[PDB]
Amino acid sequence: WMHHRMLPQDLRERVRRYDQYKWLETRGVDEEYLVQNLPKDLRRDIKRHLCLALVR
Amino acid sequence: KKIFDPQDKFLLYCNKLFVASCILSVFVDPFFFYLPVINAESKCLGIDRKLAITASTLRTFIDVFYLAHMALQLRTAYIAPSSRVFGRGELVIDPAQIAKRYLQRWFIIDFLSVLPLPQIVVWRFLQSSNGSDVLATKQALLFIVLVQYIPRFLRVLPLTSELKRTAGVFAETAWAGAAYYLLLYMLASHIVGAFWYLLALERNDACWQEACIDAGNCSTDFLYCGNQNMDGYAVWNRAKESVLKSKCRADLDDNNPPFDFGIYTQALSSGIVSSQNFIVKYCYCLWWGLQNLSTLGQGLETSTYPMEIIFSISLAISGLILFALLIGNMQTYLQSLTIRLEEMRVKRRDSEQWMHHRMLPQDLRERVRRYDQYKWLETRGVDEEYLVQNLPKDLRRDIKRHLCLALVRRVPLFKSMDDKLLDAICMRLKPCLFTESTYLVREGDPVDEMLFIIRGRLESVTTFFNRSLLKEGEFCGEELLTWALDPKSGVNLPSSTRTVKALTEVEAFALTSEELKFVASQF
Amino acid sequence: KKIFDPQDKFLLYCNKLFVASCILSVFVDPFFFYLPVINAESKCLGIDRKLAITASTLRTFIDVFYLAHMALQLRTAYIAPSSRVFGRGELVIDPAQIAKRYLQRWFIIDFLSVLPLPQIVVWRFLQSSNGSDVLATKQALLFIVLVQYIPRFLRVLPLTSELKRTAGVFAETAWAGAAYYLLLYMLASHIVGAFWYLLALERNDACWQEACIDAGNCSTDFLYCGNQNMDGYAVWNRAKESVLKSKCRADLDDNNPPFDFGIYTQALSSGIVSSQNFIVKYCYCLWWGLQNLSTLGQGLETSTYPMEIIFSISLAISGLILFALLIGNMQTYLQSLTIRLEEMRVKRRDSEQWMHHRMLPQDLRERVRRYDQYKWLETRGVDEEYLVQNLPKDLRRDIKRHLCLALVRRVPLFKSMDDKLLDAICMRLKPCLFTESTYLVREGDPVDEMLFIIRGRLESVTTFFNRSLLKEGEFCGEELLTWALDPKSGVNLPSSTRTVKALTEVEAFALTSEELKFVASQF
């Protein structure tokens, strides 16, 4: 895609750096699809452990 | 005490060496199996002496680099769960807990692998003058080396998982990846050829030690080198090469021998057990390993001796596993390389089936075929708007303005804007494609989009009727602008006054009517 | 200067030959390896003379035909990024900039592949009169041909990438694609058999040059052809076939020979090194290549000479790679050809599990099985509305007017409507399928669609109660027309007055109620 559109060679490096950084943090795992397939009671207990001492 | 953070840069070059030193150490341990020799002119069994110095020097100088690894493993800190801090895990930089974690779970598969058991039985042999101890030295290397391969293979596991986290699971796939399973054949071949050499010398020993208990004038201490100055040896020396060749000779065609050597007759009939050049001896055995691991044992002709049979059964199973692991990875590599091209071929078979079922005229089939061919040459199956929508918002805005700003700065109503709404239209333009002789709009039809020409060349007529031309940079469909601009319009689309037709292949950018009123109601 | 535009039609017919001349030139370089012979009459070593004429004519008449390519490469422009474009790239037509680009990328390994190094050592040999030149000529062809082959293989890479851009990646998948990896076996076999011939003649030379330095009455200049008029040769001529037969004879069964020939004994014991017919000599060696690359060296019996062993290790590895590349590509071809049928089989296994879990009655299982079978026979797993929605808007309208116009022009309200508004109902009609004895609507149920019969035969009753018949072309469900037409309706659906039942298998087109009011409110 970037060879076809003839992008400048400084937007190419920004795209490459975002993709490399996301691969090291997620390993391709989509976690919002994982969390929405759990039952409602346990989804609440996981989201309270992750995000409750940060919004207060 | 300079306690280390696991994502230090310093424990990254100091961990890419402890993986490459664990691969060099499983390649050095087969060299202890080449230590027994045969002195051919004197007919005695000995020990190669410049090999036992070198192969003991190299193992000791390598297994001291791995003493450094356990030193940097007590100055290291680990991550545990907590809900108090919010960075997904608290870092435990605390002595007498990091060390109490370590020496209960991975200290015994690390201490039991550096103990120099082969290095001391060479030192005792080279300080001795009893010539008949070359059998105890040769005996205490098969089991030592074979049982000290559990820790020296198993200890590569906790260090590859730490290279699985900093530079990722990734690594290249051309000149790596499928090159890794050809270099595993080469190490399995190297362990197998050295087992074969060592078991051939023990069958030759079993033959000799029983032609001496029938000749009457022999003791089993005269067969080993360095025992020529004993009484009774001057009688045995007179009749060595009549007994030892009427009873224990090796020949590849002799179908009725006094001793059966089995799979080992090729090593005693060629003379590599008495060979003086080490390159000849090494290369001959490594090619035996590679040739018998690739054909899965098919040329092997055993005897009725059971441990020889168990060695042969092991080769045919190891070769079955290695072959399947190589064919497995080469195919997953090749299937991932032609995925976009295999999708295009499935799409064309689906189109031919659908047009045969509905029984279409032959001039509509050719229009469908030409559009599909043109789109494959322009995109190669890549979906561009799915790619762009997965980038972060700041960089998406920088990519769309390199592509769509000089086009929208040619509409005169758009150059009268504040460069904030001028970057909200560049983020809803989407690409389009038109083959030759297609009609972009017909006169009297409801106008549904504006278009901006990138490539190609069109024509336009109005009511032979003062026809016109359009080329790159010009636009089309600005009756929708006057509709969406003022609220004197109603929710109904205007009608076209032109007929636009393509004379070559066109590329354009498009702007939907439901996206033009959302921009216009920012006034 | 007629500077060329890279997608000219001429540079696409003048580049489909420079690819087929590079495939033809890597098949000609093995023919230099068939130049040494043995004269069986005189027992001397020579050079085949018509083969060295012919194989030097052909390489020179191809390297200069390739010499035209880089001149045309000196006249070609290139594309660079810019934001002043309207077309995604500025064309650079300055001749001061295209050549300075060219002599940094692919000029060094294009130049070192036309240099006639094998063509001059034939010319210097054929102008000479001392017969002891057949060793320097034979020595300066193994390394020259073997090292001047990294450019003649590397120079295909840019020209293939320039055919991966204008003609797609698809050539053909059944009459090609998997036929490409069988024609690679045939070229690898052809290089391997010619290496084997040449190394057999060097072992025969090594044997002869040492039965002459032990006989005492020989100099090594008498073994080469054309040195019969020298003093000392008349003494040697009297004892040729006593020394060269008691020391360097070849026999396939002699298990104790004076010289070991190893993998080369089959070429010296059959006599193809002294053969006069070239077809026999070529075919014998090419079949040795194909037979030993296919079974990966299983039948080879080497000697203890170390370069013979390295040559065998190379064959066992190259054959492992070629085989895996052939099973990989056949399986990706076959998996892509049955993709719709395997998906029907997976869908068939899921339904039995679901109906066994819920414990359905056995009359409801057969109704599900019949619908699945009928739909597989009618569609072959092809999704037709997803196909149609991906075509451009002008061609969608033509396909949908060919399929659905003579059905909507049998409704009396619709035939009087319009011509532009008839082309908006023939865009929302969607196909349907009904097995036998199913109820299309029941009396007293809310009507939700109109239907248009394509195939099949139905019946209809109203309140045994003046029953009726319907066939192809007729319609059903026009109580929704009176509902959606006037705004005297409310947002609620009417109730049916009929009961329609299928007597055979039906196909229809359907019109949803939420799509009928959107058409009706265009009045």
Side-chain angles (χ1 to χ4, degrees), chain B residues 231-293:
Chain B
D231 62 76
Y233 186 74
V235 193
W236 162 247
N237 198 337
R238 193 179 296 116
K240 279 186 301 198
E241 40 265 23
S242 68
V243 181
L244 290 188
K245 73 158 82 75
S246 72
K247 298 203 73 158
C248 289
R249 81 190 181 267
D251 206 26
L252 260 174
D253 53 326
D254 179 281
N255 261 315
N256 208 309
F259 206 83
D260 209 17
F261 284 112
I263 53 163
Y264 307 122
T265 177
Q266 199 186 314
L268 306 154
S269 72
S270 62
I272 58 164
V273 303
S274 277
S275 165
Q276 293 275 300
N277 205 2
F278 183 74
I279 294 297
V280 171
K281 186 205 269 207
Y282 179 74
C283 286
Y284 199 78
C285 290
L286 166 80
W287 166 243
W288 192 94
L290 175 59
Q291 199 198 22
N292 280 279
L293 275 175

Side-chain angles (χ1 to χ4, degrees), chain B residues 312-421:
Chain B
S312 300
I313 289 171
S314 298
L315 266 77
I317 287 169
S318 305
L320 273 175
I321 299 175
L322 269 158
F323 187 74
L325 286 171
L326 170 84
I327 305 176
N329 279 90
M330 172 84 84
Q331 167 129 42
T332 76
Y333 166 77
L334 291 175
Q335 177 203 51
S336 175
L337 193 84
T338 42
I339 175 166
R340 296 285 157 258
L341 173 86
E342 289 313 299
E343 288 183 20
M344 195 266 300
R345 290 166 176 181
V346 167
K347 176 165 162 263
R348 286 188 321 186
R349 286 184 208 114
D350 280 349
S351 284
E352 298 303 297
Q353 181 69 246
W354 169 68
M355 289 191 300
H356 180 82
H357 180 70
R358 282 316 196 209
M359 208 46 87
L360 278 197
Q362 283 288 326
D363 71 282
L364 292 169
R365 306 216 196 178
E366 275 305 313
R367 291 213 268 155
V368 173
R369 284 172 194 143
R370 264 163 34 217
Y371 181 73
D372 283 351
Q373 266 147 32
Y374 181 44
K375 195 193 180 29
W376 172 246
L377 290 197
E378 287 296 291
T379 61
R380 318 279 163 186
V382 179
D383 191 2
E384 162 175 359
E385 285 298 325
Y386 183 78
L387 275 196
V388 170
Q389 286 302 308
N390 279 329
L391 296 164
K393 186 197 174 129
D394 193 45
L395 167 67
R396 190 160 62 239
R397 191 177 60 232
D398 275 21
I399 276 155
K400 286 306 229 159
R401 295 171 59 231
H402 183 264
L403 261 43
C404 314
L405 198 71
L407 286 166
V408 311
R409 273 197 290 101
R410 272 167 84 115
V411 175
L413 190 146
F414 280 158
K415 280 186 72 170
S416 295
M417 301 200 165
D418 46 8
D419 213 39
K420 176 177 155 172
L421 277 80

